[PDB]
Design a protein around this nucleic acid. Structure first.
Ligand SMILES: [Mg+2]
Ligand SMILES: [Mg+2]
Ligand SMILES: [Mg+2]
Ligand SMILES: [Mg+2]
Ligand SMILES: [Mg+2]
Ligand SMILES: [Mg+2]
Ligand SMILES: [Mg+2]
Ligand SMILES: [Mg+2]
Lengths: 139, 176, 97, 117, 211, 192, 43
RNA sequence: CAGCUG
RNA sequence: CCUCCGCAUAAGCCUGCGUCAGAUCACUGACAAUUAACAGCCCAAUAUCUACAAUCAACCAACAAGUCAUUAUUACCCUCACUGUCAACCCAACAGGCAUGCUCAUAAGGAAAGGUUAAAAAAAGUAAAAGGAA
RNA sequence: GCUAAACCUAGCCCCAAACCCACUCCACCUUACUACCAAACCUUAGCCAAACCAUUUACAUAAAGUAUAGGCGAUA
């Protein structure tokens, strides 16, 4: 869990156990070519590599084999109207290589107007032969 | 499997998904702790699903199908967590009578102000903790002048606010 | 061109307000209420200038000795420096002596 | 030369960048030759239940009624949890009824906490 | 741009995500996109019942008299450019179509006596009554310019006009207003114009040819 | 949303609003009179009557209530005319858009008299508070299905009181139910 | 004008929070910045 | 000194 | 046609010529990225040991006298976490400066000329009769 | 006719009255914002005025600028 004080372990103590997990996770689509086994996720900052292995093992029953994490710097170079820097938040990225020769590909997610569109068909642009004269009149 | 990060493959690109209400707190106070444990993992997996769907929504430059159910799932996780904390708190008041789960003390740092100090866990006792004993929880007498200056800055901000409220009230009585 | 183009909103003044209709009442509370109050006990204001008029150095001296103990820190400090300045001005500068 | 920017781990010389981390918790400790020993017991185990046959979906249907919020005070929890046992054993040593004076013998101590969340 | 697809594709290529937001207020239209049944000129007592069940005091034998006064008075509102009366006399499908092109030029329409009596032709039907009327009139026009020089029609001389004017009513506070004016495909060409027109050919970039 | 944000006909976060109220504007705030929460008596869907301006005397229906400016949008009344869907070379369409009304300019309507009546909040035995007119003691009431998807709980399972109130932790109860058995006793640390 | 020749060790060791709190004078430096209302009390 | 050199 | 430059690490900087879009001698918004083996981040006590430079180290040659080490007993069994990793970049100037390793003209990196004319004056370079500090 | 020009209302000032603030969770004296190992008080000085400068030089009402002090002078 995150934003929780962990109880201190002394040598010979019980197992540290988390019952309701605080930190969420999202699997993103890679921006670069990735090996077929590899799956990319946006871990929250405090989640280690080991927590991510046990997290996917416990909750999602995914046979994870390797995990590698990188912390991504979000830019502090863009300013308000007040010339004050906005920071895009930093985030941690997990690259998870799946075991047992399994393979993941990111799925293809995302594969009154009557009045407007039925007057856009009855537009009737002005004849050039009419020479600017309003064609309302029956004369 | 990893297909639990994505919803029903029928819903892909439908731009509107019928979701029900959120859990309110009183609906959740009727559930056992084992049941709130299991519901925590139901809502957990659902939340990861919706967060992948947001990030892919921003990636493909499209709008979310229905961004409401992310608000509902955060709503439910908040309510569930609040219920469980209520039961922890009530049991703590009965068994021990404390009010904070974590100990602390009102102390007074170098800067003169009174601070709720939250205790940390340590292995050695405090008198031979070398880093703890470098912190000063007392203010020397060169601070009391700045305490007075800060007191008066707060009093000026408060006076300005109260006066400004009365001026606005007079403008309302002139206008109506 | 620092002059305004449209003439401002009109200044509606109520001459028969509560304050205006009852202005000046009990200014003679002394001379026709058996001298039990002075009119100077009718005026409301700072506590150091109720029924007292002085020039600025005297207003500052009186304010310091009457209310200066509970003045704020840098207000007290500004006021000490104003007495010190106004002292050095009234006593050492001018045309007539 | 910045003061406004947050002092992060990406920022110093090598000796600075090594020490500061993000918010993650220590799992073991360093030994001689810089060899990290990982302790099994410091790593959190995700206690995750079995969701088979579980009847609670993440949303509630809109056909469910509205109720009133009654937070669980300690008076209520004492009433339902303890009060029948005291009414029964009074019509016919407080530790009998689910009270513990100390909890230094206890695994999940309530003050100060040892459990997580 | 030229349509909504161009703007939304440009907003997708740019990254402008416009969330479709839910608002409880919609637009309270009082008109129709065109005509219910296109009366093609050379049994509908159903819709007369479906009008009288809402209005309940409605004589068709008096209506083309009324349709005359809704017509003529509306056209006189062009002589002064009184738009505030036109919104009472004409629908909002019909208001731009008669007042847009006439802006920044003075018109001097006038009515003189009808050749025939005006007579109702058909009637059709949240509910929109719609009545087409045949009018066979004599009118006068003189459309001037910004500069006050004649660009259409002799001012004195009356001309004979066929007018298949379609009226519409909302069915609470609404009334009969001119909705459209059907012009049949067999109709003679209008008055010619006082000026001459050049109509350009295809503007050719150097790589193409005229054929 | 910033201080002295100006409310308008558009909702406070839309596209048109961010065009109208960008984060750097500073305007004279509108002096709206304070109407208490207990004292606001025009609701969305009330049939009302307009007292001032065009469409005076006409009785419409409240569609939107913008309560921060004491506003009522009577749907179909107090209209001007705007174009919509105006492209580069199409002139759009003419539409009767509605300008709002202050709550002073509008009165409620008796459902049996159809008259502009003053409304006082009297109290009742059956309902703690409800509106009552002045020209008659008449209660003007507050005006104005679902199939479950695969991820909604039915009303049955949503309301089963499965909670037996005990003196155990969520942690202890889940440790018992999951069959997790912990032999190692927890070792006492210092807190300071 | 290349008088500033940067390093982060000299910057934190010269002007950081810990050196500021190490002396009474430095604590008064922090207190003056806290009273002026500054966003950075130190490095 | 001899030598060179716009 | 230049190349006295390069490529890496260090220090510094902190997303600063990636993709999509737009406004502007001819930056804004969205999205995406840097994955540890390299490098940081070390060490159980208590005693007790550490006279004989480096220099192709061989002698020879010295003085200014030198950069490197354990043992005894006790305790000790888990193991690969955390952080850095991008760029056309920094300090200045409105010229200059910058540690180290390699390459010593390059496999790497670049362009002195907006177009024209071919005045004066000015700068720099080359050539110069006879003379040779006048 | 360009550039522009105009504008009231954000707020503030001086009083009065009243004795203010400060633990959602987490982190914060180590390189603050970092989960976890062996000691405080000690006369302010000077500017300035004395036309220099050297002692000296201000920091409710009324008695009273009185008694006093003072290179018996500035002044207090
Ligand atoms: Mg990394
Ligand atoms: Mg190595
Ligand atoms: Mg690199
Ligand atoms: Mg090259
Ligand atoms: Mg040139
Ligand atoms: Mg020269
Ligand atoms: Mg020569
Ligand atoms: Mg002097």
């Amino acid at each position: 869990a995150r934003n929780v004080v962990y109880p201190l372990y002394r040598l010979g103590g019980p197992q540290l156990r988390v019952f309701r997990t605080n930190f969420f996770i999202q699997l993103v689509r890679p921006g670069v070519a990735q090996p077929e086994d590899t799956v990319q996720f946006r871990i929250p900052m405090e989640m280690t590599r080991v927590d991510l292995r046990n997290y996917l093992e416990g909750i999602y029953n995914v046979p994870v084999a390797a995990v590698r994490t990188r912390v991504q710097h979000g830019s502090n170079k863009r300013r308000d109207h007040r010339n004050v820097r906005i920071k895009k938040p930093d985030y941690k990225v997990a690259y998870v290589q799946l075991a047992h020769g399994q393979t993941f590909t990111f799925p293809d997610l995302f594969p009154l107007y009557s009045m407007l569109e039925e007057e856009r068909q009855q537009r009737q642009s002005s004849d050039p032969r009419r020479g600017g004269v309003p064609s309302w009149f029956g004369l | 499997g990893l297909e639990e990060f994505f919803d029903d493959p029928k819903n892909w690109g439908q731009e509107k998904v019928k979701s029900g209400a959120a859990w309110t707190c009183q609906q959740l106070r009727n559930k056992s702790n084992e049941d709130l444990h299991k519901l925590w993992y139901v809502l957990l997996k659902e939340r990861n699903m919706l967060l992948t769907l947001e990030q892919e929504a921003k990636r493909q430059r499209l709008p979310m199908p229905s961004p409401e159910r992310l608000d509902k799932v955060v709503d439910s996780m908040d309510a569930l967590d609040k219920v469980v904390q209520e039961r922890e708190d009530a049991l703590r008041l009965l068994q021990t009578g404390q009010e904070r789960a974590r100990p602390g003390a009102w102390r007074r740092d170098i800067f003169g102000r009174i601070i709720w100090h939250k205790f940390k866990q340590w292995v050695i006792p405090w008198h031979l903790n070398k880093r703890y004993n470098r912190k000063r929880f007392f203010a020397l007498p060169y601070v009391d002048h700045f305490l007075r200056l800060e007191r008066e800055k707060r009093a000026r901000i408060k006076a300005r606010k109260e006066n400004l409220e009365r001026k606005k009230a007079k403008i309302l009585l002139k206008k109506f | 061109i620092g002059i305004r183009l449209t003439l401002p909103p009109p200044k509606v003044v109520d001459r028969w307000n509560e304050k205006r209709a009852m202005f000046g009442v009990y200014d003679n509370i002394g001379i026709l209420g058996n001298f039990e109050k002075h009119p100077k006990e009718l005026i409301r204001g700072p506590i150091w200038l109720r029924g007292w008029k002085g020039n600025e150095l005297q207003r500052c001296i009186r304010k310091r000795k009457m209310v200066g103990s509970r003045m704020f820190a840098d207000d007290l400090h500004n006021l000490n420096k104003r007495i010190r300045y106004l002292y050095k001005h009234f006593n050492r500068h001018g045309k007539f002596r | 030369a910045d003061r406004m920017s947050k002092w992060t781990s990406k920022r110093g010389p090598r000796s600075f960048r090594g020490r500061k981390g993000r918010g993650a918790k220590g799992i073991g400790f360093l030994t001689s030759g810089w060899r990290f020993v990982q302790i099994k017991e410091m790593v959190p185990e995700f206690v995750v239940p079995d969701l088979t046959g579980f009847k609670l979906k993440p949303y509630v249907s809109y056909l469910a009624p509205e109720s009133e919020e009654t937070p669980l005070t300690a008076a209520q929890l004492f009433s339902e949890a303890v009060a029948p046992a005291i009414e029964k054993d009074f019509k016919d040593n407080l530790e009998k009824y689910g009270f513990e004076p100390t909890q230094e013998g206890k695994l999940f101590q309530l003050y100060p906490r040892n459990f997580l969340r | 741009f030229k349509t909504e697809k161009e703007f939304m594709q440009h907003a997708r290529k740019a990254g402008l995500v416009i969330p479709p937001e839910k608002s409880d207020r919609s637009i309270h239209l009082a008109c129709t996109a065109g005509i219910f049944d296109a009366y093609v000129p050379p049994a509908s007592q159903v819709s007369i019942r479906r009008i009288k069940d809402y209005d309940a005091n409605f004589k068709i034998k008096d209506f083309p008299e009324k349709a005359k006064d809704i017509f003529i008075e509306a056209h006189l509102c062009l002589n002064n450019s009184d738009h505030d009366r036109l919104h009472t006399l004409v629908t909002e499908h019909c208001f731009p179509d008669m007042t847009w092109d006439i802006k920044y030029k003075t018109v001097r329409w006038s009515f003189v006596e009808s050749l025939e009596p005006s007579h109702v032709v058909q009637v059709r039907c949240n509910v929109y009554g719609q009545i087409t009327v045949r009018m066979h009139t004599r009118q006068t026009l003189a459309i001037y310019d910004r500069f006050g020089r004649l660009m259409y029609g002799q001012e004195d001389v009356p001309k004979d006009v066929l007018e298949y004017v379609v009226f519409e009513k909302q069915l609470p506070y609404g009334s009969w207003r001119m909705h459209t004016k059907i012009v049949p495909p067999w109709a003679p060409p209008k008055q010619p114009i006082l000026k001459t027109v050049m109509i350009p050919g295809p503007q050719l970039k150097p790589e193409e040819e005229y054929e | 949303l910033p201080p002295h944000y100006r409310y308008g006909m558009s909702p406070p976060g839309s596209v048109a609003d961010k065009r109208k109220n960008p984060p750097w504007i500073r305007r004279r705030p509108v002096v709206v009179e304070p109407i208490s929460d207990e004292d606001w008596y025009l609701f969305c869907g009330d049939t009302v009557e307009i007292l001032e301006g065009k469409d005076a005397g006409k009785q419409g229906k409240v569609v939107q209530v913008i309560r921060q400016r004491n506003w009522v949008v009577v749907g179909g009344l107090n209209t001007h005319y705007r174009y919509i869907g105006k492209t580069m070379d199409y002139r759009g369409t003419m539409i009767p858009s509605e300008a709002p009304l202050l709550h002073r300019q509008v009165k409620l309507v008796d459902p049996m008299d159809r008259k502009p009546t003053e409304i006082e909040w009297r109290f009742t035995e059956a309902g703690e508070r409800v509106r009552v007119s002045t020209r008659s003691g008449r209660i003007i009431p507050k005006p104005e299905t679902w199939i479950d998807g695969p991820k909604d709980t039915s009303v049955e399972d949503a309301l089963e009181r499965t909670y037996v109130p005990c003196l155990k932790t969520l942690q202890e109860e889940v440790m018992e139910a999951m069959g997790i058995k912990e032999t190692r006793k927890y070792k006492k640390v210092y807190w300071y | 004008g290349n008088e500033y020749q940067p390093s982060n060790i000299k910057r934190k060791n010269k002007h950081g929070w810990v050196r500021r709190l190490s002396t009474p004078a430095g604590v008064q430096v922090i207190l003056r910045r806290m009273l002026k209302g500054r966003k950075s009390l130190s490095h």
